[PDB]
């Protein structure tokens, strides 16, 4: 049999929506079954970019392993990795977040320029995902990331995009008037993926080294 | 007033189903449907919707006027192409009546710069939008320029807009997004638009005089 998720969709599974188990990962599958538009998916409001393409890349997989690409405790010594929690992603009653992403916050009164990189040494294409937070007010921007005019840049041999966050009051969705966009890419072996941000970045904690197959879809 | 199966956003933006209505000139509250089918026909997120909901709750004088005439306000751009399948009207593509989706004119989208002074003796409600194309192909096809910007500025408002090109999940056969903003222009103030693309200009504005209190039903 291939995969199966149940209460969650692919988005909630790949991101680590704390309501779906993140660890029932079979090493291989031919197709995927799920509820596409699901209750538990992207808990913090926003849009998943290139989401339909990511579903096809994850439809048929021969080898699938998750690994802590950026260790939470050691990768971010000048930023706060323990304060990134929201009521839109609840768990056992308290607030929670995605198991595979870390919402970085300034440490004290400073958010120094972040620059982290990973080289693909797993021998296969690694699936890397990251988010971009768009606060609701400039007060949130100063309280989370200190700096006012920030930017995020993600660079690799097969990808390049610079992110400018927009501070605006979006309609209240799941008790959040700000938005967070989710992005993903595939890093070929030997290629180096780079992250460069002065704020608003939702860094990855777990990546996915994988080997894809041809065809398949979603049921 | 009571606006049937439309919402505030679709009514103030002028969704094709809400339709150009004569409407009243004064009201104390607004009767909406819990969930309305015709809101924003092109996908997006209405910024400060709750703020605008309360400002429009009680109005004593309400008069809509063509702030930027569709015919002569945009000579250097194309004002008669901005229709979409996400905003259909009777089996054909359409758009909001109060907004104009400006597109390049040939192989050039010159720098846009339009202004309006409020000579109506009362605060005027202006609304506009920034289109975020799905792919770089649409960015070149619609506005020619790759790296664009929008700047909306008055004496009580100042913000620059940087469109982001990305493939959002398909909604109403659209993978791009379009946000909608709005500001009030005090009498005597001058609102100024400056953009090189991705700007959904205003066609009809609303000179109004508000009242205190009220909400939505």
């Amino acid at each position: 049999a291939p995969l199966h998720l149940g209460k969650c969709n692919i988005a909630g599974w790949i991101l680590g929506n704390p309501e779906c188990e993140s660890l029932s990962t079979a090493s291989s599958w031919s197709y995927i079954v799920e509820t596409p538009s699901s209750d538990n998916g992207t808990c913090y409001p926003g849009d998943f970019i290139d989401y339909e393409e990511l579903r096809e890349q994850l439809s048929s997989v021969s080898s699938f392993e998750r690994f802590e690409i950026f260790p939470k405790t050691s990768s971010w010594p000048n930023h706060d990795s323990n304060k990134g929690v929201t009521a839109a992603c609840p768990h056992a009653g308290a607030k929670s977040f995605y198991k595979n992403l870390i919402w970085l916050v300034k440490k004290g009164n400073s958010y120094p320029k972040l620059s982290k990189s990973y080289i693909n040494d797993k021998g296969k294409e690694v699936l890397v995902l990251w988010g971009i937070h768009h606060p609701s007010t400039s007060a949130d921007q100063q309280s989370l990331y200190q700096n006012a005019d920030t930017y995020v840049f993600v660079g690799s041999s097969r990808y390049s995009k610079k992110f400018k966050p927009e501070i605006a009051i979006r309609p209240k969705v799941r008790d959040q008037e700000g938005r967070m966009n989710y992005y993903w890419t595939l890093v070929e072996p030997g290629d180096k993926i780079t992250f460069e941000a002065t704020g608003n970045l939702v860094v990855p904690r777990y990546a996915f080294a994988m080997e894809r197959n041809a065809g398949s879809g979603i049921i | 007033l009571h606006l049937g199966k439309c919402n505030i956003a679709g009514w103030i933006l002028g969704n094709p189903e809400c339709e150009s209505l004569s409407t009243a000139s004064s009201w104390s509250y607004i009767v909406e449907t819990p969930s309305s089918d015709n809101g924003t026909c092109y996908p997006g997120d209405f910024i400060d919707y709750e703020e605008l909901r309360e400002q429009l709750s009680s109005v004593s004088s309400f008069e809509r006027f063509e702030i930027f005439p569709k015919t002569s306000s945009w000579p250097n751009h194309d004002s008669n192409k901005g229709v979409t399948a996400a905003c259909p009207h009777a089996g054909a593509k359409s758009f909001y009546k109060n907004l104009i989706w400006l597109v390049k004119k040939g192989n050039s989208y010159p720098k846009l710069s339009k202004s309006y002074i409020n000579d109506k003796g009362k605060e005027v409600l202006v609304l506009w939008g920034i289109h975020h194309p799905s792919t770089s192909a649409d960015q070149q096809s619609l506005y020619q320029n790759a790296d664009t910007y929008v700047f909306v500025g008055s004496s009580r408002y100042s913000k620059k807009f940087k469109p982001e090109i990305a493939i959002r999940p398909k909604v109403r056969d659209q993978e791009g997004r379009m946000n909608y903003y709005w500001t009030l222009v005090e009498p005597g103030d001058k609102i100024t638009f400056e953009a090189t693309g991705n700007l959904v200009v205003p066609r009809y504005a609303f000179a109004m005089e508000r009242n205190a209190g009220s909400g939505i039903i």
Epitope: - | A85, A92, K93, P133, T135, A137, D138, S141, I167, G176
Partner: antibody, heavy 122, light 107 residues
Framework: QVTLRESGPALVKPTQTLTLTCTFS??????????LTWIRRPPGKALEWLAL???????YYNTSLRTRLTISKDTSKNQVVLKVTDMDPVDTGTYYC??????????????WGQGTLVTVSS | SYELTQPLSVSVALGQTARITCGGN??????VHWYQQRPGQAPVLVIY???NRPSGIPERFSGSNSGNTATLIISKAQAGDEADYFC?????????FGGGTKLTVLS
């Protein structure tokens, strides 16, 4: 300035495999919303679409001819390849290489290559 | 699949207005593109997404789309307008071409 050129007029024997190479310039295939397409026109006959490849290496095919078609992009240099297995005399005609621009605007073809003549004969 | 239907041939007097139709079920909400193929040459896009005219295409080329019928309008029909015209949509991850219409200029 965009330039699309096909790879040489061909003579293919029946049941053999045709291989067409499209070289392009003036734009990058990795740009969002850029695709390359093979469209043929036989004598008489309306336009017939074959295969398409987009900026993310995804591949779409004429579903009536899926088993015979294979499209791919050369990892080196700006080139696209189309392989059509066991050709029939009905597969004779001009094969065009054209860029397809994709977006919420529709999926259209501009520009087109000058076309190459493929003749299936013994 | 999705059916696009054009007439086989359309004829118009010189200097008049030609109208080539492209039928489709609820085609008014779909993005239609028109391509011109003069005898012996490659196709060229003359009208994309219903009404838009690319650069260099003469002004007499126009297009409309509503209901179940798309239409390519060529005012002041010239002798050089004799060609084959094909409507096309990208629908359900598949190109869809119309049968094509040979336009002849009478007189």
């Amino acid at each position: 300035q965009v330039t699309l050129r096909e790879s040489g007029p061909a003579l293919v024997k029946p049941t053999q495999t045709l291989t067409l190479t499209c070289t392009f310039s003036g734009f990058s295939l990795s740009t969002s919303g850029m695709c390359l397409t093979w469209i043929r026109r036989p004598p008489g006959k309306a336009l017939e679409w074959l295969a398409l490849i987009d900026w993310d290496d995804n591949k779409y095919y004429n579903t009536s001819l899926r088993t015979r078609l294979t499209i791919s992009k050369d990892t080196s240099k700006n080139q696209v390849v189309l392989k059509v297995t066991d050709m029939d005399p009905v597969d004779t005609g001009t094969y065009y290489c054209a860029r397809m621009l994709y977006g919420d605007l529709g999926g259209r073809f501009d520009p087109w290559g000058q076309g190459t003549l493929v003749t299936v004969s013994s | 699949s999705y059916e696009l239907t054009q007439p086989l041939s359309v004829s118009v007097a010189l200097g008049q207005t030609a109208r080539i139709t492209c039928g489709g079920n609820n085609i008014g909400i779909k993005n239609v593109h028109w391509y011109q193929q003069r005898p012996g040459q490659a196709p060229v896009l003359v009208i994309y997404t219903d009404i838009n005219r690319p650069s260099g295409i003469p002004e007499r080329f126009s297009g409309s789309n509503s209901g179940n019928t798309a239409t390519l309008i060529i005012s002041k029909a010239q002798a050089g307008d004799e060609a084959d015209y094909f409507c096309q949509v990208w629908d359900s991850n598949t190109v869809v071409f119309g049968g094509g219409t040979k336009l002849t200029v009478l007189s």
